[PDB]
Amino acid sequence: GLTEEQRMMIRELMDAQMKTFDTTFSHFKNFRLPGVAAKWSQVRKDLCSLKVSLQLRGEDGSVWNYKPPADSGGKEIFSLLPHMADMSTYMFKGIISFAKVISYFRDLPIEDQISLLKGAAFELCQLRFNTVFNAETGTWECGRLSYCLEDTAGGFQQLLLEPMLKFHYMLKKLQLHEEEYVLMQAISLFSPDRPGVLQHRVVDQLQEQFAITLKSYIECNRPQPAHRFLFLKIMAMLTELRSINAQHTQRLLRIQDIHPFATPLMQELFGITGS
Numbered sequence: 001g002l003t004e005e006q007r008m009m010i011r012e013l014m015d016a017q018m019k020t021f022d023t024t025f026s027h028f029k030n031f032r033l034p035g036v037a038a039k040w041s042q043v044r045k046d047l048c049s050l051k052v053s054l055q056l057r058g059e060d061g062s063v064w065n066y067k068p069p070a071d072s073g074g075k076e077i078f079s080l081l082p083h084m085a086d087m088s089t090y091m092f093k094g095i096i097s098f099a100k101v102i103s104y105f106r107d108l109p110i111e112d113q114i115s116l117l118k119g120a121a122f123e124l125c126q127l128r129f130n131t132v133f134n135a136e137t138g139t140w141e142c143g144r145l146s147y148c149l150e151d152t153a154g155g156f157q158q159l160l161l162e163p164m165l166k167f168h169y170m171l172k173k174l175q176l177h178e179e180e181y182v183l184m185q186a187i188s189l190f191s192p193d194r195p196g197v198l199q200h201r202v203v204d205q206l207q208e209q210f211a212i213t214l215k216s217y218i219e220c221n222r223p224q225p226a227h228r229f230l231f232l233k234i235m236a237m238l239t240e241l242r243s244i245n246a247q248h249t250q251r252l253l254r255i256q257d258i259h260p261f262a263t264p265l266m267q268e269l270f271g272i273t274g275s
């Protein structure tokens with residue numbers, strides 16, 4: 001059964017989530033849009049992470065639709081980067097507000113707050129993006145914006161070869177509750193193994209408590225044979241998200257080295273000093 005401390009932990013996380021997650025993206029406005037050496041550039045073909053179609057549904061009922069180009073050996077592969085940087089920044093701001101509303105996070109030293117945010121911001125963004133992911137249509141439904149995955153030669157199986165997309169499809173298939181998503185966010189945020197964390201023992205004990213609460217929540221609310229080992233499946237998903245995070249940071253820094261695009265907040269979270 002759930003203890004009162006566990007019920008209070010979940011409510012504190014759930015309240016932080018509702019206050020800082022605009023599930024309709026209604027305040028994402030004024031964002032940029034796409035217009036109307038050599039082995040560096042060769043691995044920079046990783047920008048096929050910008051093979052997304054874009055839809056904007058106006059309040060008037062009008063619809064704008066963007067189909068991205070194909071790589072012709074030029075600068076056209078960067079066309080989606082400024083927009084995606086603006087969405088990541090909007091999402092990052094939501095993640096930061098989330099952490100700052102949590103009492104457990106507020107009580108940590110400010111240096112550890114920064115170290116935990118720098119270490120986990122991307123992971124918490126993906127966890128939030130999973131909740132608006134449509135696994136049937138392969139689209140992230142962000143209110144009036146929709147990000148559709150463009151048809152690949154292999155179709156769904158080829159898309160599931162990119163770890164990020166496989167994570168989204170696999171995590172979506174677990175059909176988690178809002179409470180389980182927010183506990184995943186807590187476990188990812190309070191990670192003692194992050195570079196620069198001073199209060200390593202406090203952060204570790206907090207992470208352990210969030211994990212017991214998730215384990216207990218699943219045990220109390222999910223008796224069905226389909227949810228056997230669910231707690232352990234979630235923990236492995238978070239271990240994989242850390243590897244995707246590390247892979248994504250390297251991919252991002254390589255693009256930034258060639259074609260700078262990162263916003264000030266992204267630079268801060270990724271350590272880019274401006275010099």
Ligand SMILES: O=S(=O)(c1ccccc1)N(Cc1ccc(-c2ccccc2)cc1)c1ccc(C(O)(C(F)(F)F)C(F)(F)F)cc1
Pocket residue numbers: 046048049050051052081084085087088126129140147162164165248251252255
């Ligand atoms: O998490 S997302 O849904 C998201 C995040 C932020 C805003 C909106 C959506 N996502 C989808 C996403 C992820 C991977 C792929 C893909 C597909 C085929 C082959 C290889 C890969 C397609 C879409 C994603 C994540 C990271 C990035 C970036 O940081 C950016 F563009 F923002 F700079 C990167 F490209 F630099 F990596 C861009 C999209």
